[PDB]
Scaffold this active site. Structure first.
Site, mmCIF file in Angstrom:
data_model
loop_
_atom_site.group_PDB
_atom_site.id
_atom_site.type_symbol
_atom_site.label_atom_id
_atom_site.label_comp_id
_atom_site.label_asym_id
_atom_site.label_seq_id
_atom_site.Cartn_x
_atom_site.Cartn_y
_atom_site.Cartn_z
ATOM 1 N N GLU A 254 0.774 -1.124 -0.088
ATOM 2 C CA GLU A 254 -0.047 0.006 -0.085
ATOM 3 C C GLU A 254 1.001 1.224 -0.032
ATOM 4 O OE1 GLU A 254 -2.090 -0.479 3.623
ATOM 5 O OE2 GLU A 254 -3.322 -2.143 3.023
ATOM 6 N N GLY B 144 -0.911 5.194 -4.401
ATOM 7 C CA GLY B 144 -1.631 4.115 -4.841
ATOM 8 C C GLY B 144 -1.011 3.033 -4.454
ATOM 9 N N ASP C 219 13.815 10.614 3.290
ATOM 10 C CA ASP C 219 12.938 9.533 3.799
ATOM 11 C C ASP C 219 13.579 8.130 3.929
ATOM 12 O OD1 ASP C 219 10.487 8.840 5.365
ATOM 13 O OD2 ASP C 219 9.266 8.310 3.346
#
Ligand SMILES: Cc1cccc(Nc2nc(CC(=O)Nc3ncc(C)s3)cs2)n1
EC number: 2.7.11.22
Lengths: 327, 826, 248
Positions: free
Chosen positions: A21, A25, A145
């Site tokens: 997930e 999308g 990230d």
């Protein structure tokens, strides 16, 4: 030609299943019908029509078509749903970002606890990550990230960086407010906790140092649910933020606001005494509070721990087997 | 959200550790037996053991040691749990009232550390000055035993040797000294340090390092008369003490690995040794006294006494009596005689304590047509392998069927009035080039027998060399009568073929009922098997007939019948086979998005798949299309040890971290993604390793049984013999029992002062989460055992919801009735 | 691997617009108007010069694959600027671009956005991305004008005059199809060359190779004067056609 993206249909892939997930999308595993190659498909939905195509995806399309590296993931192409015929306004079909399918992601191996990392395996792992980060940093792109989930690896032992959704270019000459708290709390650098907003590429380094320790401890080093709590945990091991170790800490918005319980001393070498000396020095430099004193990616690659590692000997990690599945 | 209730039907039976001492009184001789989360206290008599007290602890007992510091009249008990809850316990008795005192307690977990391969080790100094703990690689933790350390505060000493095998405090040293075996790239070594509480570091040890056997496993600390230490290996036993070095390498011990030791004579003259094949040895220290008056160790001798159950812990009690603590089989009291019997053995069994052993698989079958249901479990390993038939009648009645080989799986075939059981036995490469079994067992004592003659893999051309003495597993399908439990037939599978799955069912339009087995061709060279078989057998007229075989490119880990079709998991692939009119299996459809499809479960056209690590998957068979559709997957990565379907929406899984979790369809159809996302709504640390989930109940049903609040019944078997039960609740009943738990936890006193909420918190090396969606029924059922003042204290200000009175106050008598009904589900 | 985004002048005689009966002058004017619309809308919104240029480059490339008679330029322009903002990390909300587009356009012109301006723009994003083949990264003459100027040493004031005049020529070249003919590196050189001629400066003196009369060859290899003159001619044509004169 190979370059005319956005036209080929997703019919060309046999969808295998649901592997993740994502953010803009869902991500599916799939097999290319023509070549048999396994690919991972990230779905991009513009049907929301709130702000159109997600910028997160735009960043990944913009940056990853520029970056070429063994340790940085490859976008092979972009394909589409069967588009409506001569009616673009009615057409709400989605787009897919085609990626090379990487066998596993770090966390799943760590969460299962099945993976065992030898010193040599860690050396190969960190060196590939650092080399990929150095390439990206040399091109003046910041991941922003770094997470265990984002570090993909194949059973062969090849490591590739993956989630560039939050990535942005950095200019030393021009400092502007940037998205705050970009990195996840567990791997977030102290500067982001204090809200710099003009952060340096060193933010990614801090996260990668957190990964280094986690590979040795098999448990994330700084696990907290609150920003202040994270600072306390970091402060205990790395030392409390103080002007002597971080001369410019006073300029940070939350320095006075956010304070550890005590002015803790640095204990990293004591608490990580079990880590080999060559690696412990890398951790001390990677987990340095002051971003200006924190080591660079190139400096990590020119470290005693990683400099003499040979990438030819990928040395695959110890991945679970059927006997290991059996009790 | 989901609401569930978990209770123990049978407490853990396997012995995890056992010690002796003077714990209940300075005068009595005690035996403390540790089962997972359970402490049993006995007093030694001339006939056997007198039970005196049993307590449960909110934690897995990792360390258990008795010690007596200066100033105490009797021994104190140290316990450390696997989640690092430490405590010092004292036995106190006031006439008829027995209670356990928590003298000191705290959690000794370190923020940063690598858990060691050889697990938690805990030792105590002979002068009871400190507790040594080996929790993490490269670190030695010291809890000093001063009077003021009521919180068990401790410090770490850097340890250069990262990989430690075993450590003990030595006897006869000027300072607290540790002796330990460690491993580095140059082999294994034995080394000593002195522990300084004043400096809080190691000092140079009394004697130098010596290189030892590559598989040196255990350190025996020799008492004051000799001093020094003994090192047990695979081939040799050695004694070390400064300048003194001895080594005995008797061929008898090379045959089987020695796992447990104990001291028979307090002076160190005699130690007992046990091995994985169940043999019991005596290790003798032959003294030599010099004219100086000093006593030195002359030589070592090993003498075979007889056979015991494969023992995790041995403890010599008194006279000739030894307690044998067994994790893989039934535990025992045995008597050691001076004169051997006519067979040459010095060991004669006195008593046998039931151990359900590792419950690898189990099924529920109503043998007597009673509407009740009886549980037949695959229990034990190797010589202790057994089939255990368990019925409720207030205690559980358990029957034991000895197999003397490991039982892997079980499935019941009513048409044939028999069970099919998969089993494996150990044979060893012998001088003939073949193999020889160490003992006769179920597969060799069958009335009739057969061997597969399949030619599927016969082309071979792949070399697998054999060395004399190496072990092999030989796998069989046993046909066992349901009344006599006599082995009627044994079918031996191919060389190097491991049987992994078993079902009994009819397929398609075929009226015959078959035994179907899924196998894997296992070769040491292969990490994952790449060959396997699905074999269809028919048991008819006392013989097993091979009906059909289907070759597969992997291991058939799990099989389950699916609406007249056969659902089999081959490595990553999940496949659905049809049974043709030509009596052959034909593939219909496949699903491939699984790392390794270890487990399978079916309800309707829905399938629950358990990856090894990407958790559970909800597949659906779509008959209109003839293929599978992924309904939803649990994206949190968790290892799976066993799965089960509770209802059409809720799914149960067990983690290898001794954690249970429930996943549910998100039931929100706004987005496809929400439906495809499985939300873990239940999290619960059980403390046991679940191998088999099985729908059914052991309670007698006369049709008169009041309908319990609990709905549904899933039984599960565990490695430590524990049998538990999972059932569902309504939201109203959950809230009542949950609010009651919070009230009970404030009232009930825990051993070691361990917070109950902490104990049940879903815990992995990486994570810790508070429990959710689960009622600890063992806590609820303890309400009936707390005193009346405590009961009334619990019910104060307690309100029900949606009753006859929307807010209905509870009384101590009202709750007693509610719990008493809850005790009737097992 | 990567697409070709450069065409020959002769090829512009065969754009979809030309083949649907639009004459060369009209397509030229339609391109200037769309580019300048992008420039003016984004300038009002405070957008960086790269963001304006990126939207303009998307715009020019778009109508190499499509006709002006079937895709209104001002809608396309607004869409290109909307996407450019996200690509260059200078994002704007589509409603704000419409608001500004309405402020600057008359009623006849804003009629292109139809009954729902935002929807027409957002819908077009699909075609735009496919049309530009998801090749979002674009380089512009500005970075090369500065990279090359930094290697010039001499009178501070003469070089700054050179740069600003060249910078203006870059802004003016965004209204032309030069973006579709020559890489940005060449454009930056051509505007340095043009300004030098106009200011009567001899740039080679400012280089590390002061006797290398073809000063640009050290910055951009394999560029003939033929090309730099063709570019200069095209830039100055805009001024001559318009009332406006060279900045000087
Ligand atoms: C719940 C579940 C089941 C199965 C797989 C998963 N996720 C998993 N992904 C992987 C590998 C992976 O991410 N490869 C990628 N290649 C290219 C990308 C852009 S990402 C292993 S396990 N989750």
């Amino acid at each position: 030609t190979e370059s005319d993206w956005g036209k080929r249909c997703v019919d060309k892939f046999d969808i295998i299943g649901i592997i993740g997930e994502g953010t803009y999308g869902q991500v599916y595993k799939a097999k290319d019908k023509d070549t048999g190659e396994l690919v991972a498909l990230k779905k991009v939905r513009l049907d929301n029509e709130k702000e159109g195509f997600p910028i997160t995806a735009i960043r990944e399309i913009k940056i990853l078509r520029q970056l070429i590296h063994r340790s940085v993931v490859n976008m092979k192409e972009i394909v589409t749903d069967k588009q409506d015929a001569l009616d673009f306004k009615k057409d709400k079909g989605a787009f897919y970002l085609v990626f090379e399918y990487m066998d596993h992601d770090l966390m799943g191996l760590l969460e299962s606890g099945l993976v065992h990392f030898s010193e040599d395996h860690i050396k190969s792992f960190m060196k590939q990550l650092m080399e990929g980060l150095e390439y990206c940093h040399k091109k003046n792109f910041l991941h922003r990230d770094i997470k265990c989930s984002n570090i993909l690896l194949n059973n062969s032992g090849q490591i590739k960086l993956a989630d560039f959704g939050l990535a942005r270019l950095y200019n030393s000459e021009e400092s502007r407010p940037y998205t705050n708290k970009v990195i996840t709390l567990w791997y977030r650098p102290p500067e982001l906790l204090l809200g710099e907003e003009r952060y340096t590429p060193a933010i990614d380094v801090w996260s990668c140092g957190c990964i280094l320790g986690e590979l040795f401890t098999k448990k994330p080093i700084f696990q907290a649910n609150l920003e202040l709590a994270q600072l306390e945990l970091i402060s205990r091991l790395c030392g409390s933020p103080c002007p002597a170790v971080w001369p410019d800490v006073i300029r940070l918005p939350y320095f006075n606001t956010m304070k550890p319980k005590k002015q803790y001393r640095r204990r990293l070498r004591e608490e990580f005494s079990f880590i080999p000396s060559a690696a412990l020095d890398l951790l001390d430099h990677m987990l340095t509070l002051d971003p200006s004193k924190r080591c660079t990616a190139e400096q990590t690659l020119q470290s005693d721990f990683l400099k003499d590692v040979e990438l030819s000997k990928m040395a695959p990690p110890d991945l679970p087997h059927w006997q290991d599945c059996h009790e | 959200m989901s609401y569930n209730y978990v209770v123990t039907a049978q407490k853990p039976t396997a012995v995890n550790g056992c010690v002796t001492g003077h714990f209940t009184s300075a005068e009595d001789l005690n035996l403390l037996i540790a089962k997972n989360t359970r402490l049993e206290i006995y007093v030694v008599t001339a006939e056997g053991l007198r039970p005196v007290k049993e307590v449960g602890m909110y934690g897995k007992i990792a360390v258990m040691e008795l010690f007596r510091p200066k100033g105490e009249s009797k021994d104190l008990l140290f316990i450390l749990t696997a989640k690092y809850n430490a405590c010092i316990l004292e036995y106190k008795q006031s006439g008829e009232s027995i209670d356990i005192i928590t003298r000191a307690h705290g959690n000794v977990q370190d923020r940063i550390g690598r858990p060691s391969e050889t697990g938690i080790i805990g030792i105590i100094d002979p002068e009871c000055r400190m507790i040594g703990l080996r929790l993490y690689d490269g670190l030695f933790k010291v809890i000093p035993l001063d009077r003021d350390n009521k919180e068990l505060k401790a410090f770490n000493i850097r340890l250069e040797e990262l990989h430690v095998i075993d450590v003990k405090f030595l006897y006869g040293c000027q300072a607290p000294t540790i002796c330990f075996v460690y491993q580095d790239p140059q082999g294994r070594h034995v080394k000593t340090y002195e522990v300084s509480l004043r400096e809080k570091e190691f000092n140079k040890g009394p004697w130098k390092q010596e290189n030892v056997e590559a598989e040196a496993s255990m350190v025996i600390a020799v008492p004051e008369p000799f001093g020094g230490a003994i090192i047990i290996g695979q081939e040799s036993i050695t004694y070390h003490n400064g300048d003194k070095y001895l080594a005995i390498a008797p061929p008898i011990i090379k045959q089987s690995t020695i796992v447990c030791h104990n001291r028979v004579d307090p002076n160190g003259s005699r130690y007992l040794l046990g091995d994985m094949e169940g043999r019991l040895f005596m290790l003798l220290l032959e003294k030599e006294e010099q004219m100086d008056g000093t006593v030195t160790l002359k030589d070592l001798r090993v003498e075979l006494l007889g056979e015991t159950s494969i023992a995790e812990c041995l403890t010599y009690l008194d006279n000739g009596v030894v307690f044998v603590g067994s994790r893989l089989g039934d535990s025992q009291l045995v008597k050691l005689n001076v004169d051997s019997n006519e067979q040459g053995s010095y060991v004669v069994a006195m008593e046998t304590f039931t151990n359900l052993g590792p419950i690898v698989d189990m099924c529920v079958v109503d043998l007597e047509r009673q509407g009740q249901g009886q549980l037949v479990t695959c229990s034990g390993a190797f010589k202790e392998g057994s089939l255990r038939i368990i019925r409720n009648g207030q205690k559980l009645h358990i029957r034991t069927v000895p197999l003397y080989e490991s039982p892997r799986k079980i499935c019941y075939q009513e048409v044939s009035q028999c069970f099919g059981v998969l089993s494996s036995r150990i044979e060893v490469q012998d001088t003939s080039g073949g193999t020889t079994a160490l003992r006769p067992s179920a597969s060799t004592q069958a009335l009739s027998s057969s061997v597969s003659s399949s030619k599927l893999f016969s082309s071979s051309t792949a070399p697998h060399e054999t060395s004399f003495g190496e072990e092999v597993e030989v796998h069989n399908l046993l046909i066992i009568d349901q009344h006599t439990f006599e082995v009627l037939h044994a079918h031996q599978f191919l060389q190097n073929e491991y049987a992994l799955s078993l079902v009994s069912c009819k397929l398609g339009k075929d009226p015959n009922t078959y035994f179907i087995v899924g196998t894997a061709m296992v070769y040491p060279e292969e990490a994952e098997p790449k060959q396997g078989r699905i074999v269809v057998f028919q048991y008819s007229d006392g013989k097993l007939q091979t009906v059909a075989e289907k070759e597969v490119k992997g291991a058939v880990y799990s099989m389950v019948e699916f609406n007249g079709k056969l659902l089999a998991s081959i490595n990553s692939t999940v496949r659905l086979y049809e049974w043709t009119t030509e009596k052959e299996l034909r593939t219909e459809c496949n699903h491939y998005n699984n790392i390794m499809a270890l487990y399978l479960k079916t309800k309707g056209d829905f399938i629950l798949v358990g990856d090894l690590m990407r958790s559970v998957l909800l597949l659906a068979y779509k008959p209109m299309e003839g293929n599978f559709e992924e309904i939803a997957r649990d994206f949190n990565p968790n290892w799976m040890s066993a799965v089960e379907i509770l209802d059409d929406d809720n799914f149960l899984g067990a983690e290898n971290a001794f954690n249970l979790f429930v996943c549910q369809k998100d039931s929100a159809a706004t987005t496809d993604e929400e439906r495809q996302h499985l939300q873990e709504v239940g999290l619960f640390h059980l403390g046991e390793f679940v191998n088999v989930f099985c729908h059914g109940s052991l309670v007698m049903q006369n049709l008169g049984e009041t309908s319990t609040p609990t709905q549904g019944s899933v039984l599960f078997g565990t490695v430590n013999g524990m049998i538990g039960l999972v059932t569902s609740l309504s939201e109203s009943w959950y809230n009542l029992l949950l609010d009651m738990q919070n009230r009970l936890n404030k009232v009930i006193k825990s051993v070691g002062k361990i917070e109950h909420s902490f104990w049940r918190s879903f815990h992995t090396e990486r994570k810790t989460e508070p429990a959710t969606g689960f009622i600890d029924g063992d806590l609820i059922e303890s309400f009936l055992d707390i005193s009346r003042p405590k009961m009334q204290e619990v019910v104060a200000n307690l309100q029900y919801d949606d009753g006859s009175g929307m807010k209905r106050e509870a009384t101590a008598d009202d709750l007693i009735k509610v719990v008493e009904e809850l005790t009737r589900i097992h | 691997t990567k697409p070709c985004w450069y065409w020959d002048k002769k090829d512009l005689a065969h754009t979809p617009s030309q083949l649907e009966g639009l004459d060369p002058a009209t397509e030229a004017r339609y391109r200037r108007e769309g580019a300048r619309f992008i420039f003016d809308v984004g300038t009002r919104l405070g957008l960086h010069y790269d963001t304006l240029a990126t939207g303009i480059i998307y715009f020019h490339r778009f109508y190499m694959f499509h006709s002006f008679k079937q895709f209104p330029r001002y809608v396309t322009g607004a869409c290109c600027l909307f996407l450019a903002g996200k690509v260059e990390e200078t994002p704007k909300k589509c409603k704000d671009i419409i608001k500004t587009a309405r402020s600057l356009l008359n009623d006849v012109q804003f009629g292109q956005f139809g009954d729902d301006p935002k929807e027409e723009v957002m819908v077009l994003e699909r075609i735009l991305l496919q049309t530009i083949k998801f090749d979002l990264q674009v380089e512009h003459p500005y970075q090369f004008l500065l990279k090359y100027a930094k290697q010039l040493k001499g009178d501070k004031n003469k070089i700054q005059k050179l740069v600003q005049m060249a910078w203006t020529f870059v802004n003016d070249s965004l209204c032309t199809t030069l973006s579709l003919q020559w890489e940005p590196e060449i454009i930056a050189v051509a505007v340095m060359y043009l300004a030098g001629r106009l200011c009567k400066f001899e740039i080679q003196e400012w280089t590390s190779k002061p006797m290398y009369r073809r000063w640009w060859e050290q910055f951009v290899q394999d560029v003939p004067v033929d090309v730099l003159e063709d570019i200069c001619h095209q830039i100055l044509d805009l001024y001559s056609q318009g009332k406006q004169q060279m900045p000087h």
